[PDB]
């Protein structure tokens, strides 16, 4: 039921606390080992740790690897491909130290030696010295912590047979079956060491609230709140003697309590009882101390004391020294879970708090300048640039601090109007180029001496700067030449860089992604019918036959075909408006009709149409014929919200809401009443704003065409409204943000346009559409003014009377309806 994606990101949640549990081994727990030299030498260390560093440090380079890949994951893929994360990995038997480490921690004696290591000479008052709780904390829960890295190898090998199973790309299979293969003798070897009874037993030892009822459902005598009322997870349950009391008492522990209950299972009730298996008998609310006791020949052995609140204490025995070490381990581990993490933390800021920069020379990369108020303006949670210099805006596009994968689209969406695809090649090939740190002094007195340089600055430098960088520049590249190849396919010479580009690219820690990308590049290299599901409908005819021309009209052509071909003419219109006819806003400057042509053709045909509807209503003086021509028109605008012609049903309320037809009331009473709404409904979609209309095309499904207003009225307002340049210190910054929101709107344009109507052309019917010409020779305001003196005459202002016309259609006037019928 999970996919490869959810297994992947359930991973990395997991090796994010695992990461965090073997800082916390490692910073509290090991280093005050480390440190006492004179109580531990090399060894005592290693014996009790064994390779946890390595571990570690193998542990965070996966995870390293596994985010970069996910985060250059273009949506290309069907899901981020992390088998070849795992195959390098185990092809250079990375993984080995796990075998070690468990054979170390496993082995039949380990548990007894660390206890030697803690009770000799001085060791328990040192680790007292280190801090409260350190000494129990050491004992009783680093020996349960010690085996997080077992569970979490052999975790490993299972998830490797998922993945592998469920990958979606033969490539990554394959990187994973070779993974699997590559880590047989590790999983072999600490399956030996695992099988084995002793650490069968520890293994098993520390590895919905639908239990906290079900528990407490079986508790008789319940007293105070509910389990769920003051606790969130179920730790342990076992059974211990309470020195002094009569009968082992059974034991739930939770997280916020411990409860002790007394057995009656299998014992005789009255009827009506409660059938329970166990009796409360000590409700402990878990918030206070609790101490380890030595064995006392008051035949209690293997016991500790439990400290309340003003509450008198209680001593507990267990069945052996194994039982009462789970109990302590849970119980400290309970008691000081906070506190070891305070001690994590503590150290965690320190650690990342003597880190000093020492960025690049500015002289010697140009991406080092300081971050200032004159190359780039922050949006007043990672920061959002307003504004910026086209250096500042690449050095953000590729920074080294946090992720933006919204930027990179932005970025290569946009860019054109401010940097040329020659320029921006060079600059992040620039960007790329980063010079390494000289030596630090340290590294110069070993290099001195002749020894090998620790190099820790160089290092840390090379992983949280340098790969970073260079990833991004090359996440760009691949986004550019996939999803923006006609930059390339218009510059011979910039695919000619790229590539070259690509080729120069030297260090096994970028062969994976530079192989990728050339691949890429080749076989966009290598390389308008449409194809559909289904079959379209039947054309529909009405009184005007096929190849009859000169009778079509509004009333003969059957409103069904009417609405679909007008629905194909004006789709055709506006899927044929490119982005060059809307930025700058050029569909409003005196050179309109050269740079937005296909623009202004969408548009007039819209108006033209609107203005036959208002001519067709108000040319017919009958009110009877008027009532069956308005109920037409009402019935195409119904077809058109069926095809999502949004564009369509907005011609026809135009049209209604126009002056000579708006004002037609014996009309509009003779409407039926469902007609009415329909129209109503449609008008609705304008209103405030187009509220109605912008939540309906964000609900509905394509095919359908989008009204094309909206996003020209959204394009003008964006393009006036904002600055072209932001002014810093004196500087000129590009404003990016005002393009990436002209862009935000011509992609909303195009996510609607690829989907094309499952119709048929009818050519004839086409051809009545393209030449309707309302106006005829007549200027606009002679036939506007036409129209309303039309619809004067027709119906006279109160409180003239309503005088009578004679009919003009020699056919029916009835309408054949608009559901389609099935014959062929």
């Given at each position: 039921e999970q996919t490869y994606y959810d297994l992947v990101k359930a991973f990395m949640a997991e090796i994010r606390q695992y990461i965090r549990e073997l800082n916390l081994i490692i910073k509290v727990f090991r280093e005050p080992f480390v440190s006492n030299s004179k109580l531990f030498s090399a060894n005592d260390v290693e014996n009790i740790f064994s390779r946890i560093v390595d571990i570690h440090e193998l542990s965070v380079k996966l995870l390293g690897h596994i985010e970069d890949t996910v985060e250059m994951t273009d949506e290309g893929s069907p899901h981020p491909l992390v088998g070849s994360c795992f195959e390098d990995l185990a092809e250079e038997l990375a993984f080995d130290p796990y075998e070690s480490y468990a054979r170390d921690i496993l082995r039949p004696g380990f548990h007894d030696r660390f206890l030697s290591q803690l009770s000799k000479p001085g060791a328990a008052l040192y680790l007292q010295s280190i801090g409260e709780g350190f000494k129990e904390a050491v004992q009783y829960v680093l020996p349960r912590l010690l085996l997080a890295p077992v569970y979490h190898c052999l975790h490993y090998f299972e998830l490797l047979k998922q993945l592998e199973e469920k990958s979606e790309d033969q490539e990554d299979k394959e990187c994973l079956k070779q993974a699997i293969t590559a880590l047989l003798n590790v999983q072999s070897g600490m399956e030996k060491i695992c099988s084995k009874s002793l650490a069968k037993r520890r293994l098993s030892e520390s590895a919905a609230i639908k239990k906290m009822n079900e528990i407490q459902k079986n508790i008789d005598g319940w007293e105070g709140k509910d389990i769920g009322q003051c606790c969130n997870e179920f730790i342990m349950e076992g059974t211990l003697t309470r020195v002094g009391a009569k009968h082992e008492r059974h034991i739930f522990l939770f997280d916020g309590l411990m409860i002790c209950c007394k057995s009656n299972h299998g014992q005789p009730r009255l009827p009506g009882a409660s059938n329970a298996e166990y009796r409360l008998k000590e409700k402990f609310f878990m918030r206070k101390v609790q101490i380890?006791?030595?064995?006392?020949?008051?035949?209690?052995?293997?016991?500790?004391?439990?400290?309340?609140?003003?509450?008198?204490?209680?001593?507990?025995?267990?069945?052996?020294?194994?039982?009462?070490?789970?109990?302590?381990?849970?119980?400290?581990?309970?008691?000081?879970?906070?506190?070891?993490?305070?001690?994590?933390?503590?150290?965690?800021?320190?650690?990342?708090?003597?880190?000093?920069?020492?960025?690049?020379?500015?002289?010697?990369?140009?991406?080092?300048?300081?971050?200032?108020?004159?190359?780039?303006?922050?949006?007043?949670?990672?920061?959002i640039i307003k504004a910026g210099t086209v250096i500042k805006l690449i050095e953000r596009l590729t920074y080294h601090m946090y992720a933006d994968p919204n930027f990179v689209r932005t970025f290569l969406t946009t860019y054109r109007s401010f940097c040329k695809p020659q320029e921006l090649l060079s600059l992040i090939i620039e960007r790329f180029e980063i010079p390494e740190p000289e030596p630090t002094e340290a590294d110069r007195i070993a290099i001195e001496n002749g020894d090998q340089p620790l190099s820790a600055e160089l290092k840390r430098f090379r992983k949280e700067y340098i790969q970073p960088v260079q990833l991004r520049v090359l996440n760009v590249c691949r986004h550019w030449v996939e999803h923006h190849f006609y930059?390339?396919?218009?510059?011979?010479?910039?695919?000619?860089?790229?590539?070259?580009?690509?080729?120069?690219?030297?260090?096994?820690?970028?062969?994976?992604?530079?192989?990728?990308?050339?691949?890429?590049?080749?076989?966009?290299?290598?390389?308008?019918?449409?194809?559909?599901?289904?079959?379209?409908?039947?054309?529909?005819?009405?009184?005007?036959?096929?190849?009859?021309?000169?009778?079509?009209?509004?009333?003969?052509?059957?409103?069904?075909?009417?609405?679909?071909?007008?629905?194909?003419?004006?789709?055709?219109?506006?899927?044929?408006?490119?982005?060059?006819?809307?930025?700058?806003?050029?569909?409003?400057?005196?050179?309109?009709?050269?740079?937005?042509?296909?623009?202004?053709?969408?548009?007039?045909?819209?108006?033209?149409?609107?203005?036959?509807?208002?001519?067709?209503?108000?040319?017919?003086?009958?009110?009877?014929?008027?009532?069956?021509?308005?109920?037409?028109?009402?019935?195409?605008?119904?077809?058109?919200?069926?095809?999502?012609?949004?564009?369509?049903?907005?011609?026809?309320?135009?049209?209604?809401?126009?002056?000579?037809?708006?004002?037609?009331?014996?009309?509009?009473?003779?409407?039926?009443?469902?007609?009415?709404?329909?129209?109503?409904?449609?008008?609705?979609?304008?209103?405030?704003?187009?509220?109605?209309?912008?939540?309906?095309?964000?609900?509905?499904?394509?095919?359908?065409?989008?009204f094309f207003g909206i996003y020209l009225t959204n394009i003008l307002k964006t393009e006036e409204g904002n600055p072209e340049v932001l002014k810093r210190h004196g500087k000129e910054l590009i404003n990016f943000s005002k393009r990436r929101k002209v862009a935000e709107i011509t992609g909303e344009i195009q996510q609607y346009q690829n989907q094309p109507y499952c119709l048929r052309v009818e050519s004839d019917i086409k051809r009545f559409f393209e030449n309707l010409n309302p106006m005829g020779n007549s200027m606009e305001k002679e036939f506007t003014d036409y129209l309303f003196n039309k619809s004067l005459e027709i119906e006279p202002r109160n409180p003239k009377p309503l005088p009578r016309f004679p009919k003009k259609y020699s056919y029916p006037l009835k309408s054949p309806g608009v559901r389609p019928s099935n014959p062929r």
């Open positions: 380890n006791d030595k064995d006392d020949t008051n035949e209690y052995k293997h016991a500790f004391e439990i400290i309340l609140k003003d509450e008198n204490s209680v001593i507990f025995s267990a069945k052996s020294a194994e039982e009462k070490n789970n109990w302590m381990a849970a119980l400290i581990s309970l008691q000081y879970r906070s506190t070891l993490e305070r001690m994590l933390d503590v150290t965690m800021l320190q650690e990342e708090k003597e880190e000093q920069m020492r960025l690049p020379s500015a002289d010697v990369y140009r991406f080092a300048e300081p971050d200032s108020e004159e190359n780039i303006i922050f949006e007043e949670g990672i920061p930059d390339f396919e218009r510059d011979a010479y910039l695919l000619q860089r790229m590539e070259e580009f690509i080729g120069t690219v030297r260090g096994k820690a970028m062969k994976k992604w530079v192989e990728s990308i050339t691949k890429i590049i080749q076989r966009k290299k290598i390389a308008h019918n449409i194809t559909f599901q289904s079959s379209p409908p039947t054309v529909e005819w009405h009184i005007s036959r096929p190849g009859h021309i000169e009778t079509f009209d509004l009333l003969t052509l059957h409103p069904i075909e009417i609405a679909r071909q007008l629905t194909l003419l004006e789709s055709d219109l506006y899927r044929a408006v490119q982005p060059s006819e809307l930025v700058g806003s050029v569909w409003t400057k005196e050179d309109k009709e050269i740079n937005s042509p296909n623009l202004l053709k969408m548009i007039r045909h819209t108006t033209n149409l609107t203005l036959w509807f208002e001519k067709c209503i108000v040319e017919t003086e009958n009110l009877e014929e008027r009532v069956a021509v308005v109920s037409r028109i009402i019935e195409i605008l119904q077809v058109f919200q069926e095809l999502n012609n949004f564009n369509g049903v907005l011609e026809v309320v135009s049209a209604m809401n126009s002056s000579p037809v708006y004002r037609l009331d014996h009309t509009f009473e003779q409407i039926p009443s469902r007609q009415k709404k329909i129209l109503e409904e449609a008008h609705e979609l304008s209103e405030d704003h187009y509220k109605k209309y912008l939540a309906k095309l964000r609900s509905i499904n394509p095919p359908c065409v989008p």
